[PDB]
Amino acid sequence: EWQENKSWNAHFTEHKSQGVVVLWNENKQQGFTNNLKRANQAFLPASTFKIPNSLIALDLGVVKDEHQVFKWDGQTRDIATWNRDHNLITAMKYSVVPVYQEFARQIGEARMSKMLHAFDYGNEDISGNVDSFWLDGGIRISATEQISFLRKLYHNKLHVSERSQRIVKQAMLTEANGDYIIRAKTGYSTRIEPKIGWWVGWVELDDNVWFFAMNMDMPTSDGLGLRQAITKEVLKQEKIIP
Ligand SMILES: [Cl-]
């Protein structure tokens, strides 16, 4: 059910990096990873938490739909794409933390906690500030736990409406061409050591789906592009994408 393929470690070592890639073949119900231990080590989800956060905000009516505009609050932040109006789609695309902080405040601690338990999400622990616990609070999730959650989302099996799940999966759209569709979310955790980058999601093919979750040490922002690059090298190696 879970096979360790250390040959993938070469895709990390070659970049003077360390991390884990977990793949799940949905048709075969078989998983693969380069590092079983790290695949089950739990980290802050950081912006990958925007997947459950979006679902909860939609199902509770905090977000009415993917067109609702969340106006910039006028406070200049260091990430230029954050200093503008957003909807759910663009807030996901640019990982706009302040928009999702407001979602969390309107959701509130009690409902957030209850929904993360219903989702079986990570350690289900929201300890910390309601508007930042996924960045510097008590919540933790492993790569294998990301896969479990994403599989439920793909199959509309999470305990929210079908509509909420379809909208978030739309918002996760990252890449599409004649060969594959990637629905995914990046993450970048810097507030608690070790600093890591995340990429979690799945690859849709004509006749199969491959779920993936990767994290890697990210001592500086210079390596952020390796989250997608390393994953894609694994996907290419396994003949999942050309
Ligand atoms: Cl879509």
Swiss-Prot record:
Activity regulation, short description: Inhibited by avibactam, related diazabicyclooctane (DBO) derivatives and by bicyclic boronic acids, via a covalent binding to Ser-47. Inhibited by chloride, bromide and iodide ions. Not inhibited by the beta-lactamase-blocking agents, clavulanic acid or tazobactam.
Residues modified as N6-carboxylysine: 50
Any one cellular-component term (Gene Ontology): plasma membrane
GO molecular function: beta-lactamase activity; penicillin binding
Catalytic activity: a beta-lactam + H2O = a substituted beta-amino acid
Induction of its expression: Expressed from an upstream promoter, P(out), in an insertion sequence IS1999.
UniProt-annotated binding residues for a beta-lactam: 47, 50, 95, 227
Pfam families given in the database record: Transpeptidase (PF00905)
PROSITE patterns: BETA_LACTAMASE_D
Extra facts: When OXA-48 is present in clinical isolates of K.pneumoniae, increasing chloride concentration during antibiotic treatment reduces bacterial growth.
Family membership: Belongs to the class-D beta-lactamase family.
Name of the protein: Beta-lactamase OXA-48
Organism listed in the record: Klebsiella pneumoniae
Gene encoding the protein: OXA-48
